[PDB]
C-alpha cells in the first residue's frame, strides 16, 4: 500500500488510531515477546560466563521491560494498519457497485457437475 | 456413561463449535478473495487510494507578475 | 523509504529547487513556465498512472 | 515436601492450565448456542444454558 | 586515527545515508552516495597492510564509476522532462542507466567482481559497516523510483545475482568471501520483489541486516578467518558453537527458525501474480546457497576437529572482548517466526 | 618419525556388572536404579498398560456403531411394517432434479 | 533480440522450413557470440589468434546446436503433425544434447545434456502451449 | 489440544533445571503422564472430525498416529542412555530437550488444520533430527547421512509450498473442512499435472519412493537409536499422513498421472525386498524392510479405495511399532558385539535365552503372522489392488514370500545355532532392554485384540 | 578469598543497578499510564 | 534536439570506454574520470542555458566541486599505492587473489 496518509510522513499513529481498542492485557503475542525477553536475558547471562539464571536479575527485568514496551507499541501500530486496510477496502467496495456483481448463486438442483467415477 | 460424563465434550458442544468455526472461516475466505479482487482492479484503474505514487506537490507553484509577459 | 522529515519539521530546504515555476530569485520567467503550470494543475490529486492516462 | 521437591508437580499444573484455557476458548467461541437446525430444543429448564 | 575523528567519520557515514533518505532533489542523492563513499574509504585501512590499500583502490574505482553513471542518468532525465522530484522517471534510457548504476553499486552478478576483493583484506568492523550501509541506502532510492523500471532489467539482474552468489559460495574456505557471496544472493532476493510489493523487500532488508549484524558480531567475538579457527573456538567457547549453529541455520532459511519469514512472504506476494516457474527456480537456487552454510556448521559444531593446544593457557582468560548488541539481535533474529503479521509495521 | 596424534588409548569395557550384580540396567547409582525400576514398572505397565486396555475395552460408541445397529433394526422394522421396499434407490428426490437438456 | 525470438515464434508449428531452422541458427549463434565474448573477456586468451579460434569454436558449436535442434523439430513436426504435445521438442532437446556430447567428444556429459536439454525444451513448449507468461504479469 | 501443547512447554525447562542423577526419572515419569493424557483424547464420533479453535482438530487419520508418537517418546528416551552416559550433563540435557522439542513439533504437525501450517511443522520436524543424527551418528559418514537427509527433504518438499500458496489464492483459506466443501475438479491440462506432480513428488521423496530412496539407508545406519526410531516411524508415517491429507483435492487427474508412480513403487518394492536379503550390516536390513513396506503403503494410498485407506493406516501403525522395536533390538546387539555387521554376531540361543524370544516375536510380527496388524494392513491392500487390476496380485504375493524369507533369514542367520567361541563378553540381558521389549509388544497384542480403533476415517 | 591482585568486578557499583531498576520501573509506570489513557480514550470516543 | 548534444554524449561514451579499458596506468584511469566529469559538466550546463532555468544553476559548480574532491581522494590513494609498491601498474595488484 502507498499512502493514503502520505501527508503526515511519520505520524506514528493519528487520532484515527484512537478509535480502535489497544492491545489488551495478557494477549498471547505480548506474552510471547516477554518470554523472548527472558530468553534474551538467559543468553546474555550465558555469553559473559557469569552463571546462567543467576546474578543478573536486574538485567533480566530490564530486558523484559524493554521488549514488552517495544512489542506493545508495535502491536498498536499493527492493529491500526490492518484496520485502515480493512476500512479502505470497504470504502472501495461501497464506492463502485457495478464492478462487483452479486453472483446469482444457483442451488445444487440445477448446477451440473462433471463426475468421472473413480474405481 | 461415567467416562462420557466426566471427560468428554457433548456432541451438541462439538457440533456447534464446528458450525461457528466454519462461519468464521467462511468470512475469512470471502474477505481474502474480496481483497485480491480489490487489489487487482485498483492496479487496473488507478482510481483507488492505494497505488497512488506521489506526484508533484503543487503548493509551491506561484503566479506573480514576471519580468517578461511571454512566459 | 521516502521519509519527509522535510515535511514533518516544517522546513522547506529542498522544495525550492524542484521544478520551473518555483521562485526564481528575482521575479523572472523561465522558458516553459506556463506549460508546467498546465501540467502541474492537471496532475496534483492524481495517482501517477492516470497522470499518464 | 512440596517446597522441598516441586519438580514432580509442574506438568499437571501445565495440563490444568491448558484445560482452563480450553474452557475459556469454549466460552469465547460460544456462538450458535441454540441457533442450529438439528440441535435446537427449548432452553429448559434449569438456567439459560445448553453447553459450557 | 584519533577516536574523536573516528566518531566524526562514522557520523558522516550516517549523514550521507540520511541525506540519501531525506531529499527530493536528485543532486542531494548523488551527494549522499558520494559522501558515503568518501567516508567509507578510511573505515578501511584501519590496519597498515597493503591488502587494505588495494581493496580500497578497487572499491573506489567501481563505486565512483557507478556514481558517475548515476549522474549521467540524472542529467539525461533533465535533458528530458525537467524536474527535481524523486518520482516516476520520463526516459527508458535514463531508467536503464540508473538501474545499472545502482546494480554496480549494491552488487549484481555482472557487477559484483569487487565484493569478495573488498571484503577479503579489510578488518571485520569495516566489512560489517560497509555491508550494512552500502546494501541499505540505494534500496531507499530504488523504493522511490520503482514505478518506471523495465522489469526485465531488475528481474534478470536478480535471477543472475542469486545464482552467481550461490555458485560462487560453495568453493571458498575463507569466511568473508562466504559472507560476501551470501550478500550478493540476498541482494538478488531483495531486488527481485521490488516491482510487485516493496514492503517485502524492505522487510527483507531489516531481517538481512539483523542477520549480518549477528554474524559479524559473533565473528568479532573471536578473531577467526578460517574454519580451522572456528573449530578451535568450538573447543574454547561452547555457547558460541550453538549460536553459530542457530544463526547459520537461520541464514539457511528453515521454517521453525526466523530465516523463513523473508523468503516465504516474498513467495506469497510473488505468486499472487502469475509467476510460478520463476519463484520455484529462485527458491531451488535458495536451496543451492545453503550447502556452504552446512559445511560451515559441520566444521564448527556438528563435528569436532582436532584442536591445537595453548588453549590450555587460554582457558584461564574468558571471552573478554566487546559485544555490540549480541543477545537482543540474536533472539530477534532467531525466535521471530510467529510474528509474521509484523509485515505491516513497515507501511 | 611421525605420529599425527597424541590422544590416549580409550575407552575400556566398563562392565555395568562386576560391581553390582543385583543392579538393573543403567548407570552406577544403586538407589536411582531402583527408582527407575519403580517408575517404569509402575508407570508403564501398572497404571498405563492395563488402564489403557480397559479403556479401549469399552469406551463410547466409537464411530456411532451400536447407534447404527439399533437404528437399522428399527428402520428395517419400519420398512417391513409399511410394505414398501427396504432401501429404495435414489436417496435424493427424483423429482427435485434438473437435468441439462439438449 | 526479442524481435527475432518472436520471429522464431512467428512460424506456425506447422512447418515453413529452412526459415525456422535459420531462425534457430541465428538464435544459437547469437548466444554463442555472447558466451564467447564472456570467455574472451575473462581469460586473456594470449593472443588474438587464439581468441578468434575460441570464439569460432563457441559460436560454431552453439549455432550447430541450434541447427540440429531446428532440423529435428522441423522433421518431427512434419511427420507426426501434432502441435499439442511437446514430445517433438523432447526429442529435439535430446538430439541437441547428444550432438553437444559429440562436439565435446565425451559420452557422460552428452547423455546428461540429452536428459537436461530434452526436459527443459519439452518444458518450454509445454508452458508455451498452455500459456505461462514471460517474466511478469507485471500487474497484480 | 492446547492442553497437550502447553505441558510439553512446561516439561522442557524442568529438565534444564533438573539436578544431577535426577534428569531421568523426571523426564520418564512426566512423559508417561503425557501418555495417559494422550489416551484421554480418543473420542472421534461418527459424521465429523473433532474441531478446536482454528488450529486444532482430530481424526482417526491423526489420533492413532498422535498416540503412537506420545507413546513412543518414553520408549525413545529409555533407549537413549548408556550410549551417551559418559558424556556431559549439559550435553545430555541438550539432547533430551532436543527430543522434547522434536516431539512438540510432531504433535504440532499431526494436529494441523491448514496445509501451510503443516508445511511449517513439516520442516520443523526436519530440523532437529539433522543435528541429532549428524552429531551422535557414531560412524565416519554420519556427516554424509545428515546431509543427504536434509537436502532430499528440503529439495523435494520446497515447491509444495508454492503449490500451496497457489491453492491459497485460488480457493480462499486452507482449512481441511473448506477444502472438503469448496473443492472442484481440475481437468487434464498440463499445469494441473505439474501442481499435482510437485505436491505428490515432495511427499514421494518423504516416503521414500524407489527413485529417491538412497535418502534412507545412510541415515539409518549412521544415527543414534532415538533419532533412528523417530526418523523411520514418525517421519515416514508423517509423509503418508500428509499425502492422505492433500489427496482429497485433485481427484480427476490422478488416474492419468498415477500410473508411473504405482508402477515404480511396485517394481521397487520387489527390488527392495530382494536387496534386503543378501546385504551385510544387520541394521540396514530393517531399513530396506521399511522401504518395501512404505512402497506398499504408496500403492495403497494412490489406488483410492476405502479398504485401501483402512489397510493403509493399519499397515502404518503396525510397521511403526515393529520397526521401532527391531531397531531397539539391533541396538542391543550392537551394544553386545560392537560390530554392526551381520555374520560376526552369532549364536544367541544358549546365550540370552529370552532375548531370543523377543527377536522371534518381532520377526513374526514382521513376517505377517496372522494376528499381527501388519497382516491386516497387507490383506486389505491386497484386496484393494486385486480390485484395481486383477493381475497385480502376483507382485503382491511375491513380495509376501520374499518378505517372510528375508525376515526369517535375519532371524536364523545371527540367532540360530553356534557362538563363535571368541565373543566372550556378553552379559545377560538388562531389565531395561526387556522393559523396552514389553513396552513395544504388549500394546501391539492388546491392540490386536480389539483393533477397530486404528482403522481409518472411512470406518 | 582465593583472589590475587584484584577481583576486577563482582562487587558491583551502586549507580548502574539503581539506574537500570529506576528506568525499568519508570517505563512500566509509563506503559500502565499509556494503557489507562488508551482505555479512557476508547470509552470516551465510543 | 540541439545537435551539439550529440557530440557531447559521444564524448561521454568515449570517455566511459576509455575509463573501462585501460592498459597499465591508474593515473590514466583517474584522468578519464576527470574527463567524464567535464563531459557531464558541459552537457548539464548547456541544458540549463537552453532552459533558462537559472534558479538551478547549482549542477555545474556543485557537481564539479564534488567530483573534483573525488579525484583528489583517488590521487591520494594512488600516492599510497605507489608508496607501498614501486610503481602504480595494474600488474603487481594481482595479490589478494580471489
Ligand atoms: C517440480 C516443479 C514444481 C513447480 C511448481 C509447481 C507449480 O505450480 O507448477 C506450475 C508451473 C507453472 O504453471 P502455472 O502455475 O503458471 O499454471 C497456471 C495455469 N493457468 C494459467 C491456467 C491458471 O510449472 C512449472 O513450474 C513447471 C516446472
Ligand atoms: C528430482 C529430485 C532432485 C533432488 C536434489 C537434491 C540435492 C542433490 C543431492 C544433495 C547432496 C549432495 C552431496 O552431499 O554431495 C556430496 C558433496 C561433497 O562430498 P565430496 O565431494 O566427497 O567432498 C568431500 C570433502 N569433505 O557435496 C557437494 O559437492 C555439494 C555440491 C552442491 C549441491 C547442492 C544441492 C543441489 C542444488 C542444485 C541447484 C541447481
mmCIF file of C-alpha atoms and ligand atoms in Angstrom, chain E residues 170 284 287-288 291, chain H residues 144 147-148 151-152 155 212, ligand 2:
data_model
loop_
_atom_site.group_PDB
_atom_site.id
_atom_site.type_symbol
_atom_site.label_atom_id
_atom_site.label_comp_id
_atom_site.label_asym_id
_atom_site.label_seq_id
_atom_site.Cartn_x
_atom_site.Cartn_y
_atom_site.Cartn_z
ATOM 1 C CA UNK E 170 30.490 -23.316 -2.491
ATOM 2 C CA UNK E 284 15.581 -24.053 -5.684
ATOM 3 C CA UNK E 287 18.226 -24.424 -1.684
ATOM 4 C CA UNK E 288 21.549 -24.238 -3.539
ATOM 5 C CA UNK E 291 25.394 -26.133 1.309
ATOM 6 C CA UNK H 144 27.001 -37.678 4.702
ATOM 7 C CA UNK H 147 23.492 -34.050 4.564
ATOM 8 C CA UNK H 148 21.597 -36.413 2.232
ATOM 9 C CA UNK H 151 18.953 -31.913 1.090
ATOM 10 C CA UNK H 152 16.484 -34.526 -0.128
ATOM 11 C CA UNK H 155 14.742 -30.122 -2.259
ATOM 12 C CA UNK H 212 14.832 -41.449 -4.420
HETATM 13 C C1 LIG K 2 14.370 -34.546 -8.543
HETATM 14 C C2 LIG K 2 14.976 -34.567 -7.150
HETATM 15 C C3 LIG K 2 16.271 -33.781 -7.026
HETATM 16 C C4 LIG K 2 16.830 -33.730 -5.615
HETATM 17 C C5 LIG K 2 18.152 -32.991 -5.490
HETATM 18 C C6 LIG K 2 18.708 -32.969 -4.079
HETATM 19 C C7 LIG K 2 20.104 -32.395 -3.972
HETATM 20 C C8 LIG K 2 21.186 -33.257 -4.595
HETATM 21 C C9 LIG K 2 21.962 -34.098 -3.599
HETATM 22 C C10 LIG K 2 22.446 -33.291 -2.411
HETATM 23 C C11 LIG K 2 23.616 -33.880 -1.644
HETATM 24 C C12 LIG K 2 24.908 -33.906 -2.445
HETATM 25 C C13 LIG K 2 26.095 -34.229 -1.588
HETATM 26 O O1 LIG K 2 26.058 -34.361 -0.398
HETATM 27 O O2 LIG K 2 27.208 -34.346 -2.311
HETATM 28 C C14 LIG K 2 28.435 -34.571 -1.583
HETATM 29 C C15 LIG K 2 29.385 -33.477 -1.981
HETATM 30 C C16 LIG K 2 30.541 -33.344 -1.031
HETATM 31 O O3 LIG K 2 31.240 -34.604 -0.953
HETATM 32 P P1 LIG K 2 32.730 -34.733 -1.508
HETATM 33 O O4 LIG K 2 32.797 -34.173 -2.877
HETATM 34 O O5 LIG K 2 33.154 -36.131 -1.283
HETATM 35 O O6 LIG K 2 33.594 -33.820 -0.530
HETATM 36 C C17 LIG K 2 34.497 -34.358 0.464
HETATM 37 C C18 LIG K 2 35.139 -33.172 1.124
HETATM 38 N N1 LIG K 2 34.759 -33.081 2.555
HETATM 39 O O7 LIG K 2 28.584 -32.256 -1.924
HETATM 40 C C19 LIG K 2 28.759 -31.353 -2.897
HETATM 41 O O8 LIG K 2 29.663 -31.388 -3.687
HETATM 42 C C20 LIG K 2 27.669 -30.323 -2.881
HETATM 43 C C21 LIG K 2 27.501 -29.602 -4.207
HETATM 44 C C22 LIG K 2 26.294 -28.686 -4.205
HETATM 45 C C23 LIG K 2 24.979 -29.420 -4.035
HETATM 46 C C24 LIG K 2 23.824 -28.526 -3.622
HETATM 47 C C25 LIG K 2 22.465 -29.202 -3.669
HETATM 48 C C26 LIG K 2 21.854 -29.266 -5.060
HETATM 49 C C27 LIG K 2 21.404 -27.916 -5.597
HETATM 50 C C28 LIG K 2 21.063 -27.894 -7.079
HETATM 51 C C29 LIG K 2 20.946 -26.491 -7.648
HETATM 52 C C30 LIG K 2 20.514 -26.436 -9.102
#
